[PDB]
């Protein structure tokens, strides 16, 4: 809904969190008999490039915001997208 994957793969998301430190991005095959892979992006950026993968298999890119503790910590949650 808010996460976009513009081909050439470039992931982009709006900052919906209070006092973001950094992000944690996970990616692997939707379903899939592997664990997701995990890399970190500075607080200041809200894009990331994903290279590798495979065409034809579905992917789930999830964005996690690591943030200062606040009144909104308790209710926060990731953004995700599915593409191929």
């Amino acid at each position: 809904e808010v996460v976009v994957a513009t081909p050439t793969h470039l992931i982009s998301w709006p900052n919906l969190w209070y006092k973001v430190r950094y992000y944690r991005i996970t990616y692997g095959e939707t379903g899939g008999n592997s664990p997701v892979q995990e890399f970190t992006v500075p607080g200041s950026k809200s894009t990331a490039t994903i290279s590798g993968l495979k065409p034809g298999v579905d992917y789930t890119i999830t964005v996690y915001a690591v943030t200062k503790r606040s009144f909104w910590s308790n209710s926060a949650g990731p953004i995700s997208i599915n593409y191929r």
Binding site: V4, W13, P14, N15, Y18, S75, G77, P78
Partner: protein, 108 residues
């Protein structure tokens, strides 16, 4: 028909249709038990819940408002907190009513 933020959820037009499924995602609503999802503003205990919803003025006066720009588009972000009055005779029932609706979906 109406833009999301102006939509009224009713018996005809459920919370799921108007506001999407309840969910853990930052951009998903988390509030409402099965009964609320199904009745919206027709819900028996709506005005007990509605007394906590800000007016336009108070929305813009109390909250923290941001702007975020990306491909998906342009998002106006809002973040705030409404202080419950603990002298209020009905304080307890206000709390238990709110807590029953928060994160309800996780158990259904």
């Amino acid at each position: 028909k109406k833009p999301r933020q102006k939509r009224t959820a009713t018996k005809a037009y459920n919370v799921t249709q108007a506001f999407g499924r309840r969910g853990p995602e930052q951009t998903q609503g988390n509030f409402g038990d099965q009964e609320l999802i199904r009745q919206g503003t027709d819900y028996k205990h709506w005005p007990q819940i509605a007394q906590f919803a800000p007016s336009a003025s108070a929305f813009f006066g109390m909250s923290r408002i941001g702007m975020e720009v990306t491909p998906s588009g342009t998002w106006l972000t809002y973040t705030g907190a409404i202080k419950l009055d603990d002298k209020d005779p009905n304080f307890k029932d206000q709390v238990i009513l709110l807590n029953k609706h928060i994160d309800a979906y996780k158990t259904f």
